[PDB]
């Protein structure tokens, strides 16, 4: 029977804004060519969401989640379907509770409309996938470590210094105050509660963290914790740790790129044969370390998926 290979590629350069980046769209275009030529993906099975001014499908929070949900629509049980999601753009960290002095923080990505997609949103996404399928997520963004909440850390801070790179770099992380101020410019509300702005602007399209009552979220987290005891289909390759940022390398000359995304491309160009998920992250860490980048890519997946081939390459 046919095995499906679906991909959603998101790149946010935020052009002509206060948080402009330059290498995110190039990351998407390079990753599209890689999966088309090496990993058996087909053009009709790849959705690209980039925010260049002439783009007809912008990487908004609703458009990203709808494209990911279209992938969940086609994944079948016992099929071994291969789902891929690449994100290059800004990341951020938000309070875990509705307080100005939270004890812990949640990781999130920043779509072009700032409709934040947090780690609990990606945890619900991978829990919608049947057993035997794989969802490989490469997030070249700041604070990308832990973007799939409760996904087991395989490579990370719990599992001689090189000179800093001479490349011209820019951080792919936005401070929480900058994200809050961006949303306040649209609502006009005077509050530090970022959930109030997101519910106000996007309603049902807001993240799970902001639209669900505390009782419904706890119950939802308990059902996911129960299912994760038997099914674990999520694979996250982050560009940095939860407390780090990811580097945007270059200037606005058309050749900028993400440091982590480029490190992945370098490893693939030098190793044409099939390689495990954990070996790809380890060799990507080696490339960034020798090149003078201080971000540490991480891997989050089950023990079995750590030994599985990246994108199930034959």
Per-residue tokens: 151: 């996904």
- Residue ranges of domains in the chain: 5-173+203-312
162: helix, coil or strand? coil
Length of the chain: 314
Instruction: Quote the CA–CA distance of 223 and 225 in Å, as a whole number.
Output: 5
DSSP 293: -
Query: Which residues does the chain break after (C to N > 2.5 Å)?
Result: 159
Sheet containing 134-140: which strands, arranged edge to edge? Answer: 46-50, 5-11, 82-88, 134-140, 234-238, 298-300, 153-155
Alpha-carbon distance values, 106 to 44, 91, 96, 173, 242 (Å): 34, 11, 6, 14, 9
Tokens found for residue 110? 């920043």
Q: Measuring CA to CA, how many Å separate 248 from each of 4, 130, 167?
A: 32, 35, 10
Report the alpha-carbon distance of residue 51 to residue 25 in Å, rounded: 8
Give the three-class secondary structure for 124: helix
Taken in order 134, 119, 224, 46, the sign of the CA dihedral is negative
d(CA 50, CA 25): 6
Whole-angstrom Cα Rg for the chain: 18
Nearest to 175 by CA among 91, 259, 61: 91
Helix (H, G, I), strand (E, B) or coil at 55: coil
Angle made by CA atoms 138, 126, 122, in degrees to the nearest 5? 65
Contact 278, 310 (CB under 8 A): no
Which uninterrupted H or E stretch holds 105? Answer: strand 105-109
Structure token digits, residue 185: 């410019």
Nearest to 31 by CA among 257, 305, 308: 257
CA 256 to chain centre: 19
Q: Which of 181, 157, 134, 142 is nearest to 307 (CA)?
A: 134
Q: How far is CA 87 from CA 17, 120, 135, in A?
A: 19, 17, 13
What is the Cα 124 distance to its own chain's centre? Answer: 14
Count the neighbouring beta carbons within 10 Å of the beta carbon of residue 241. Answer: 19
**The CATH classification of domain 5-173+203-312, taken from the options 3.40.50.720, 3.20.20.60, 3.40.50.12660, 3.30.465.10:** 3.40.50.12660
Strands 134-140 vs 153-155: parallel, antiparallel or unpaired = unpaired
* C-beta separation of 167 from 256 below 8 A: no
Residues whose CB is less than 8 angstroms from the CB of residue 145 and which lie 6 or more positions away in sequence, other chains included: 107, 156, 238, 240, 241, 242, 243, 244, 298, 300
Cα–Cα distance for residue pair 302/231, rounded to 1 Å: 9
Query: Within 10 A of 177 (CB to CB), how many other CB atoms are there?
Result: 10
Count of CA atoms in the C-beta half-sphere (13 A) of 84: 25
User: What's the start-to-end Cα distance of the chain, in Å?
Assistant: 16
Q: Which two tokens stand for residue 273?
A: 């044969």
* Measured distance CA(179)–CA(201) in Å, rounded: 13
Assess contact for 64 and 117: CB atoms under 8 A: yes
């Amino acid at each position: 029977m046919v095995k499906k290979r679906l991909a959603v590629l998101v790149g946010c350069n935020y052009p002509n804004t206060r948080n402009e980046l330059h290498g995110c769209i190039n990351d998407v275009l390079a990753m599209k060519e890689t999966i088309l030529s090496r990993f058996g993906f087909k053009q009709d099975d790849i959705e690209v969401l980039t925010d260049e001014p002439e783009s007809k499908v912008k990487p908004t929070g609703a458009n990203i989640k709808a494209a990911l949900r279209r992938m969940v629509d086609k994944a079948q049980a016992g099929s071994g379907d291969i789902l891929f999601f690449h994100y290059s753009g800004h990341g951020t960290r938000i309070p875990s509770v509705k307080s100005a002095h939270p004890f812990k923080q949640d990781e999130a990505i920043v779509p072009c409309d700032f409709n934040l997609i947090t780690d609990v949103d990606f945890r619900e996404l991978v829990n919608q996938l049947p057993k035997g399928t794989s969802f490989t997520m490469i997030s070249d963004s700041g604070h990308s470590g832990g973007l799939i909440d409760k996904e087991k850390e395989q490579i990370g801070p719990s599992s001689p210094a090189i000179e800093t790179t001479n490349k011209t770099i820019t951080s792919r992380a936005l401070p929480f105050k900058a994200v809050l101020d961006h949303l306040s410019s649209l609502t006009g509300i005077t509050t530090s509660d970022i959930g109030t702005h997101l519910l106000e602007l996007f309603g049902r399209d807001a993240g799970l963290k902001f639209r669900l009552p505390a009782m419904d979220l706890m119950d939802l987290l308990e059902t996911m914790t129960a299912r994760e005891k038997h099914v674990d289909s999520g694979i996250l390759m982050s560009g940095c740790q939860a407390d780090e940022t990811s580097a945007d390398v270059g200037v606005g000359n058309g050749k900028a790129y993400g440091a982590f995304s480029n490190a992945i491309q370098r490893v693939l160009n030098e190793n044409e044969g099939a390689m495990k998920n954990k070996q790809l992250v380890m060799m990507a860490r080696d490339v960034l370390e020798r090149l003078g980048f201080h971000q540490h890519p991480c891997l989050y997946c089950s023990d079995q998926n750590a030994d599985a081939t990246f994108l199930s390459q034959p």
